[PDB]
Design an enzyme around this catalytic site. Structure first.
Site, PDB file in Angstrom:
ATOM      1  N   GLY A 117       0.812  -1.208   0.000  1.00  0.00           N
ATOM      2  CA  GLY A 117       0.000   0.000   0.000  1.00  0.00           C
ATOM      3  C   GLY A 117       0.849   1.263   0.000  1.00  0.00           C
ATOM      4  N   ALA A 184      21.098  -7.584  25.174  1.00  0.00           N
ATOM      5  CA  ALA A 184      20.479  -8.361  26.247  1.00  0.00           C
ATOM      6  C   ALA A 184      19.132  -7.787  26.686  1.00  0.00           C
ATOM      7  CB  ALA A 184      21.425  -8.497  27.443  1.00  0.00           C
ATOM      8  N   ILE A 187      13.964  -9.529  23.773  1.00  0.00           N
ATOM      9  CA  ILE A 187      14.062 -10.490  22.675  1.00  0.00           C
ATOM     10  C   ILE A 187      15.344 -11.305  22.782  1.00  0.00           C
ATOM     11  CG2 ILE A 187      14.187 -10.744  20.159  1.00  0.00           C
ATOM     12  CD1 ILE A 187      12.360  -8.246  19.951  1.00  0.00           C
ATOM     13  N   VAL A 189      17.246 -12.015  25.445  1.00  0.00           N
ATOM     14  CA  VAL A 189      17.296 -12.967  26.550  1.00  0.00           C
ATOM     15  C   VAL A 189      16.348 -14.132  26.293  1.00  0.00           C
ATOM     16  CG1 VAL A 189      18.115 -11.257  28.219  1.00  0.00           C
ATOM     17  CG2 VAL A 189      15.655 -11.795  28.086  1.00  0.00           C
ATOM     18  N   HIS A 450      -6.539 -19.734  47.771  1.00  0.00           N
ATOM     19  CA  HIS A 450      -5.435 -20.488  48.349  1.00  0.00           C
ATOM     20  C   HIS A 450      -5.492 -21.929  47.880  1.00  0.00           C
ATOM     21  CE1 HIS A 450      -2.347 -21.398  51.401  1.00  0.00           C
ATOM     22  NE2 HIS A 450      -2.974 -22.555  51.513  1.00  0.00           N
TER      23      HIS A 450
HETATM   24  C1  LIG Z   1      -8.276 -33.063  50.424  1.00  0.00           C
HETATM   25  C2  LIG Z   1      -8.637 -31.623  50.669  1.00  0.00           C
HETATM   26  C3  LIG Z   1      -8.228 -30.655  49.761  1.00  0.00           C
HETATM   27  C4  LIG Z   1      -8.540 -29.305  49.959  1.00  0.00           C
HETATM   28  N1  LIG Z   1      -8.121 -28.375  49.016  1.00  0.00           N
HETATM   29  C5  LIG Z   1      -8.422 -27.124  49.209  1.00  0.00           C
HETATM   30  C6  LIG Z   1      -7.980 -26.154  48.226  1.00  0.00           C
HETATM   31  O1  LIG Z   1      -7.353 -26.405  47.202  1.00  0.00           O
HETATM   32  N2  LIG Z   1      -8.341 -24.848  48.517  1.00  0.00           N
HETATM   33  C7  LIG Z   1      -9.050 -24.433  49.634  1.00  0.00           C
HETATM   34  O2  LIG Z   1      -9.301 -23.230  49.765  1.00  0.00           O
HETATM   35  N3  LIG Z   1      -9.456 -25.355  50.557  1.00  0.00           N
HETATM   36  C8  LIG Z   1      -9.162 -26.628  50.340  1.00  0.00           C
HETATM   37  N4  LIG Z   1      -9.565 -27.555  51.267  1.00  0.00           N
HETATM   38  C9  LIG Z   1     -10.300 -27.077  52.449  1.00  0.00           C
HETATM   39  C10 LIG Z   1      -9.366 -26.507  53.536  1.00  0.00           C
HETATM   40  O3  LIG Z   1      -8.442 -27.504  53.980  1.00  0.00           O
HETATM   41  C11 LIG Z   1     -10.198 -26.006  54.721  1.00  0.00           C
HETATM   42  O4  LIG Z   1     -11.233 -25.156  54.240  1.00  0.00           O
HETATM   43  C12 LIG Z   1      -9.370 -25.225  55.744  1.00  0.00           C
HETATM   44  O5  LIG Z   1      -8.284 -26.054  56.161  1.00  0.00           O
HETATM   45  C13 LIG Z   1     -10.169 -24.755  56.943  1.00  0.00           C
HETATM   46  O6  LIG Z   1      -9.293 -24.013  57.815  1.00  0.00           O
HETATM   47  P1  LIG Z   1      -9.573 -23.891  59.355  1.00  0.00           P
HETATM   48  O7  LIG Z   1      -8.480 -23.085  59.949  1.00  0.00           O
HETATM   49  O8  LIG Z   1     -10.992 -23.350  59.568  1.00  0.00           O
HETATM   50  O9  LIG Z   1      -9.557 -25.387  59.945  1.00  0.00           O
HETATM   51  P2  LIG Z   1      -8.554 -26.614  59.878  1.00  0.00           P
HETATM   52  O10 LIG Z   1      -7.614 -26.450  58.747  1.00  0.00           O
HETATM   53  O11 LIG Z   1      -9.421 -27.892  59.861  1.00  0.00           O
HETATM   54  O12 LIG Z   1      -7.721 -26.525  61.205  1.00  0.00           O
HETATM   55  C14 LIG Z   1      -8.320 -26.762  62.498  1.00  0.00           C
HETATM   56  C15 LIG Z   1      -7.203 -27.148  63.444  1.00  0.00           C
HETATM   57  O13 LIG Z   1      -7.659 -27.097  64.812  1.00  0.00           O
HETATM   58  C16 LIG Z   1      -7.159 -28.213  65.507  1.00  0.00           C
HETATM   59  N5  LIG Z   1      -8.027 -28.411  66.650  1.00  0.00           N
HETATM   60  C17 LIG Z   1      -9.367 -28.670  66.606  1.00  0.00           C
HETATM   61  N6  LIG Z   1      -9.936 -28.731  67.783  1.00  0.00           N
HETATM   62  C18 LIG Z   1      -8.897 -28.466  68.664  1.00  0.00           C
HETATM   63  C19 LIG Z   1      -8.842 -28.387  70.067  1.00  0.00           C
HETATM   64  N7  LIG Z   1      -9.894 -28.590  70.866  1.00  0.00           N
HETATM   65  N8  LIG Z   1      -7.647 -28.107  70.630  1.00  0.00           N
HETATM   66  C20 LIG Z   1      -6.587 -27.911  69.843  1.00  0.00           C
HETATM   67  N9  LIG Z   1      -6.522 -27.964  68.510  1.00  0.00           N
HETATM   68  C21 LIG Z   1      -7.717 -28.247  67.979  1.00  0.00           C
HETATM   69  C22 LIG Z   1      -7.096 -29.331  64.474  1.00  0.00           C
HETATM   70  O14 LIG Z   1      -6.174 -30.315  64.921  1.00  0.00           O
HETATM   71  C23 LIG Z   1      -6.622 -28.551  63.239  1.00  0.00           C
HETATM   72  O15 LIG Z   1      -5.205 -28.469  63.150  1.00  0.00           O
HETATM   73  C24 LIG Z   1      -9.268 -28.927  51.097  1.00  0.00           C
HETATM   74  C25 LIG Z   1      -9.673 -29.896  52.012  1.00  0.00           C
HETATM   75  C26 LIG Z   1      -9.358 -31.237  51.810  1.00  0.00           C
HETATM   76  C27 LIG Z   1      -9.816 -32.260  52.808  1.00  0.00           C
HETATM   77  C1  LIG Z   2      10.990 -11.892  18.238  1.00  0.00           C
HETATM   78  C2  LIG Z   2       9.930 -10.944  18.739  1.00  0.00           C
HETATM   79  C3  LIG Z   2       9.163 -11.295  19.844  1.00  0.00           C
HETATM   80  C4  LIG Z   2       8.169 -10.444  20.328  1.00  0.00           C
HETATM   81  N1  LIG Z   2       7.433 -10.844  21.434  1.00  0.00           N
HETATM   82  C5  LIG Z   2       6.519 -10.029  21.889  1.00  0.00           C
HETATM   83  C6  LIG Z   2       5.744 -10.451  23.040  1.00  0.00           C
HETATM   84  O1  LIG Z   2       5.893 -11.508  23.653  1.00  0.00           O
HETATM   85  N2  LIG Z   2       4.782  -9.526  23.448  1.00  0.00           N
HETATM   86  C7  LIG Z   2       4.520  -8.309  22.839  1.00  0.00           C
HETATM   87  O2  LIG Z   2       3.629  -7.589  23.308  1.00  0.00           O
HETATM   88  N3  LIG Z   2       5.247  -7.930  21.744  1.00  0.00           N
HETATM   89  C8  LIG Z   2       6.199  -8.751  21.306  1.00  0.00           C
HETATM   90  N4  LIG Z   2       6.931  -8.374  20.202  1.00  0.00           N
HETATM   91  C9  LIG Z   2       6.617  -7.084  19.572  1.00  0.00           C
HETATM   92  C10 LIG Z   2       5.392  -7.173  18.643  1.00  0.00           C
HETATM   93  O3  LIG Z   2       5.618  -8.110  17.586  1.00  0.00           O
HETATM   94  C11 LIG Z   2       5.086  -5.795  18.052  1.00  0.00           C
HETATM   95  O4  LIG Z   2       5.007  -4.847  19.105  1.00  0.00           O
HETATM   96  C12 LIG Z   2       3.775  -5.765  17.265  1.00  0.00           C
HETATM   97  O5  LIG Z   2       3.817  -6.789  16.270  1.00  0.00           O
HETATM   98  C13 LIG Z   2       3.499  -4.421  16.624  1.00  0.00           C
HETATM   99  O6  LIG Z   2       2.244  -4.489  15.917  1.00  0.00           O
HETATM  100  P1  LIG Z   2       1.917  -3.522  14.728  1.00  0.00           P
HETATM  101  O7  LIG Z   2       0.512  -3.909  14.257  1.00  0.00           O
HETATM  102  O8  LIG Z   2       2.075  -2.107  15.166  1.00  0.00           O
HETATM  103  O9  LIG Z   2       2.971  -3.865  13.587  1.00  0.00           O
HETATM  104  P2  LIG Z   2       3.515  -5.187  12.902  1.00  0.00           P
HETATM  105  O10 LIG Z   2       3.194  -6.369  13.733  1.00  0.00           O
HETATM  106  O11 LIG Z   2       5.026  -4.958  12.637  1.00  0.00           O
HETATM  107  O12 LIG Z   2       2.682  -5.285  11.584  1.00  0.00           O
HETATM  108  C14 LIG Z   2       2.883  -4.370  10.483  1.00  0.00           C
HETATM  109  C15 LIG Z   2       2.376  -5.041   9.225  1.00  0.00           C
HETATM  110  O13 LIG Z   2       2.229  -4.076   8.161  1.00  0.00           O
HETATM  111  C16 LIG Z   2       2.756  -4.618   6.972  1.00  0.00           C
HETATM  112  N5  LIG Z   2       3.088  -3.496   6.114  1.00  0.00           N
HETATM  113  C17 LIG Z   2       4.011  -2.521   6.365  1.00  0.00           C
HETATM  114  N6  LIG Z   2       4.050  -1.578   5.454  1.00  0.00           N
HETATM  115  C18 LIG Z   2       3.075  -1.961   4.546  1.00  0.00           C
HETATM  116  C19 LIG Z   2       2.624  -1.387   3.342  1.00  0.00           C
HETATM  117  N7  LIG Z   2       3.131  -0.267   2.813  1.00  0.00           N
HETATM  118  N8  LIG Z   2       1.630  -2.023   2.684  1.00  0.00           N
HETATM  119  C20 LIG Z   2       1.122  -3.145   3.196  1.00  0.00           C
HETATM  120  N9  LIG Z   2       1.472  -3.773   4.318  1.00  0.00           N
HETATM  121  C21 LIG Z   2       2.460  -3.130   4.950  1.00  0.00           C
HETATM  122  C22 LIG Z   2       3.892  -5.532   7.417  1.00  0.00           C
HETATM  123  O14 LIG Z   2       4.164  -6.476   6.386  1.00  0.00           O
HETATM  124  C23 LIG Z   2       3.272  -6.156   8.674  1.00  0.00           C
HETATM  125  O15 LIG Z   2       2.485  -7.314   8.417  1.00  0.00           O
HETATM  126  C24 LIG Z   2       7.945  -9.215  19.686  1.00  0.00           C
HETATM  127  C25 LIG Z   2       8.720  -8.862  18.584  1.00  0.00           C
HETATM  128  C26 LIG Z   2       9.709  -9.714  18.101  1.00  0.00           C
HETATM  129  C27 LIG Z   2      10.522  -9.298  16.910  1.00  0.00           C
END
Ligand SMILES: Cc1cc2nc3c(=O)[nH]c(=O)nc-3n(C[C@H](O)[C@H](O)[C@H](O)COP(=O)(O)OP(=O)(O)OC[C@H]3O[C@@H](n4cnc5c(N)ncnc54)[C@H](O)[C@@H]3O)c2cc1C
Ligand SMILES: Cc1cc2nc3c(=O)[nH]c(=O)nc-3n(C[C@H](O)[C@H](O)[C@H](O)COP(=O)(O)OP(=O)(O)OC[C@H]3O[C@@H](n4cnc5c(N)ncnc54)[C@H](O)[C@@H]3O)c2cc1C
EC number: 1.8.1.4
Lengths: 472, 481
Positions: A117, A184, A187, A189, A450
């Protein structure tokens, strides 16, 4: 045979293809011109997409071939790299996504013109195809989205054979025995780490004193470099390249010196990757004849609606000022066409995140410590290490930390900096926080699930707001 | 001394005495000390951290992570990326060792944090013996009295038993036994298709077991999951090989002379009797609040019909200096829920405001794909009569998911029809557990779908699908689908 249009977009990268879709969705009769064989620009074809594919695949190769999988009870007798197949997975992803853009253009009634263009009048773009045929588009508005190109290194000629740009580095046919990377930044790195994982001896040479490019926080950058060095990635910082010689035996002799002077040496390699920057591309677009002058760095100056000095001709993305990133270009494309339809136009570059997709990842948004100091802002710091995060510890993947910078008087989050697992996804919660003007306390009081890595973002904000985290 | 175990039996004075060291109790104790309270935490078990750290979230997520990587290596995924391996073998002992190492490090971490914050740790069984008194009974028979201004009950939960089926942690296991099986069972039956049952079933399915979950209700994933999300999740798990018998009741189980188990089942409404056989039976029909021998009856603190301690918006029981939080009170039985209640409860004791919005508490299922949600489901909005609109975006159209060749699922956003306010976010696919926290932050502010659509999500990231689903809800159309 001319086409009439309301909006003609020149370029189909992140900025242009999204602008074209959005313009059509707003009711504009829309044309998108692209010179290359596929849509999607730099990002899809030689940029973000192929680089992230190789980063993913090379990380998994490292987990299997090294110690990680064995430590989890996943035992494998031999682990071998099939580089052709790894490159095929990369290419399959690129092909699918480029075809996806072609479908989206059809779904939204965007007319796709294949050709180079040139703006041939205030209301006219002429596309010249490879065989010399022309297609004229008479158009109310013109949107320049012509993107960027690699910045050449004076005196070193890239041939994409033994001296490559990022394009050549993404498609090498064999793992080089030794590779040198000039630059560095993000790109350099990323691509250096890919080839290091796959078996290459890698050194990056950088004129400045830190890795990761402009705007990275210095503390984050130093800790990141130390982790990469332990992986085997070598660095020569504060070092200038004076030249490189293509040798008769196919290798490359690279002449280097200390950036401040002296300490001349020569290092030899099999592949030299030149990645010192990228720059705006406007070649043969017709700007001089229209009177649209460029700034000293080659960008097209635009106003807050992205209008050039000719108000129906606009420019967005890598061809204008601001961070040269894909999501930045996309958002500029959207708001530019919304403005053409009469709406408001807003982007806050302080809320645009940056990501480095190494392992560990690095991501940040807002201001660094160095920026706050230069601006004279009184701030406080909260830090939380991933070694104290339950999900990271459960996964046995504990490098790094979250660092939050907050304003002393108001508790406003001023910047978020993440080095470690999941940084690239986590920074988007931070971007929402900055967009909303969140306080550190606000984030601390979110009920982060969590166990998740996001809990470290909450804890670092709690440290900044209250002075102390719970779990560190 | 900051550790009061057997032999340490002098009377102690405290401002805040926390009973239990789970997510709710240990965090409450640390925060109370940081606010200036002289703080004691009583724990009966040998380690700190409660259910979550010792037999819950932490060991389950470790096995989910490791078994997912086993699947990637042993199946088709790694080969498709050019990572070629002659043989892939499971070493279950080593996989369990990685799990145990993580648990040990985190339990030791809590002990260090108590020491750092000057929390006194009393190892013993706590019983409330007066309005301002807790008596701890230790393993040696000794007793120690704590005279305390405030008491915080954080005694947590226990497994809900199934009448007539005795859990022995041998061939009939609870989640605890299932987390430590010594070999992959040939066939496993899971009673209960809630979050815990689906996670543990998927672990063992990936490692080689033939798994069937039997569930009395008509959907998987527990209470409050959006029905469309639940149905799509079930179909994905079935394609992985996880079988389900929904709308089905278990009538009994018998351990047989060949060592296997016959499980008798019927349609939930009656009829269609069958028997299914397995090598291991996992009983995971629920969990329930634990308050045994705490002294509540003598104090006059009556429980609700489900065994929970009633509390007000400051987490006060009917006795105003005795508080309760976590799995022992109403609300979602989740670790981050218990933690947040503990923090705000002790902040209230120190004079602050106390507020938690349970509509902003996320839920996560750590399968692959993950499931996560916050806010309201479609069924909730319909039952409340709220007029809403829907935005959806599939991960198959997201650049990061497609580049990684990891494309199951979608993001679904529910927005209020007139005002564009985000009412609920539901994520099925890669990265759901981390992504849902961006949604939780948005809900805290009462953000609109447009607000989120205009955030500059990094490219390429999974978060872009969250942006796109909000754009579809707000504007009517996404960019990339
Ligand atoms: C397999 C599994 C996977 C889970 N994965 C997730 C997850 O990915 N994300 C998430 O958000 N939740 C997850 N949960 C739920 C999470 O573990 C519970 O919601 C969370 O641990 C509740 O925290 P809490 O402090 O209320 O009680 P708890 O973690 O049950 O702690 C209560 C503590 O009080 C102690 N205790 C009780 N009574 C007494 C007492 N009379 N005297 C002294 N110590 C006492 C117990 O020994 C225990 O250590 C998971 C649960 C299970 C079973
Ligand atoms: C190796 C590498 C990795 C990159 N990684 C990232 C990344 O992870 N994240 C990120 O955000 N950016 C990254 N970038 C930068 C990113 O590619 C540019 O910022 C982005 O492509 C710019 O977009 P643009 O539309 O302005 O231009 P361009 O993407 O350069 O597009 C311009 C287009 O116009 C065309 N053109 C030009 N003149 C004419 C004309 N006269 N007639 C018709 N067509 C024409 C060209 O052929 C081209 O297709 C990277 C760049 C490189 C080189």
């Amino acid at each position: 045979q001319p086409i009439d249009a309301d909006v003609t977009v020149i370029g189909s990268g992140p900025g242009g293809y999204v602008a074209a879709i959005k313009a059509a969705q707003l009711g504009f009769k829309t044309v998108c011109i692209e010179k290359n064989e596929t849509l999607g620009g730099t990002c899809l074809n030689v940029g973000c997409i192929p680089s992230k594919a190789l980063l993913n695949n090379s990380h998994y190769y490292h987990m299997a071939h090294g110690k990680d999988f064995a430590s989890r009870g996943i035992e494998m007798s031999e682990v071998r790299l099939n580089l052709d197949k790894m490159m095929e997975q990369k290419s399959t992803a690129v092909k699918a996504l480029t075809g996806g853009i072609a479908h989206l253009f059809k779904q939204n009634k965007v007319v796709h013109v294949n050709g180079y263009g040139k703006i041939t009048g205030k209301n006219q773009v002429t596309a010249t195809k490879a065989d010399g045929g022309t297609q004229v588009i008479d158009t109310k508005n013109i949107l320049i989205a012509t993107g960027s190109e690699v910045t050449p290194f004076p005196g070193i000629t890239i041939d994409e054979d033994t001296i490559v740009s990022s394009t050549g580095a993404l498609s090498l046919k064999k793992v080089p025995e030794k590779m040198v990377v000039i630059g560095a930044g993000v790109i350099g790195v990323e691509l250096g780490s890919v080839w290091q994982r796959l078996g290459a001896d890698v050194t990056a040479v950088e004129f400045l004193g830190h890795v990761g490019g402009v705007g990275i926080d210095m503390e984050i950058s130093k800790n990141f470099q130390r982790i990469l060095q332990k992986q085997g990635f070598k660095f020569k910082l504060n070092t200038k390249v004076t030249g490189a010689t293509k040798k008769s035996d196919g290798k490359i002799d690279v002449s280097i010196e200390a950036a401040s002077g002296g300490k001349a040496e020569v290092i030899t390699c099999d592949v030299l990757l030149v990645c010192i920057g990228r720059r705006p591309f406007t070649k043969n677009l017709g700007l001089e004849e229209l009177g649209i002058e460029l700034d000293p760095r080659g960008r097209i100056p635009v106003n807050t609606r992205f209008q050039t000095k000719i108000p129906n001709i606009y420019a967005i993305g890598d061809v204008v000022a601001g961070p040269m990133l894909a999501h930045k270009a996309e958002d500029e494309g959207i708001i530019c066409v919304e403005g053409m339809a009469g709406g408001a136009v807003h982007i806050d570059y302080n809320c645009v995140p940056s990501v480095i997709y190494t392992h560990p990842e690095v991501a940040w948004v807002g201001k660094s410590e160095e920026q706050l100091k230069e601006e004279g802002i009184e701030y406080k710091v909260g830090k939380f290490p991933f070694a104290a995060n339950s999900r990271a510890k459960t996964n046995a993947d504990t490098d790094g930390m979250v660092k939050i910078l907050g304003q002393k008087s108001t508790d406003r989050v001023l910047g978020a900096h993440i080095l470690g697992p999941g940084a690239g996804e986590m920074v988007n919660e931070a971007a929402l926080a900055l967009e909303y003007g969140a306080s550190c306390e606000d984030i601390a009081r979110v009920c982060h699930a969590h166990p998740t890595l996001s809990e470290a973002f909450g804890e670092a904000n709690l440290a900044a707001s209250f002075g102390k985290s719970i779990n560190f």
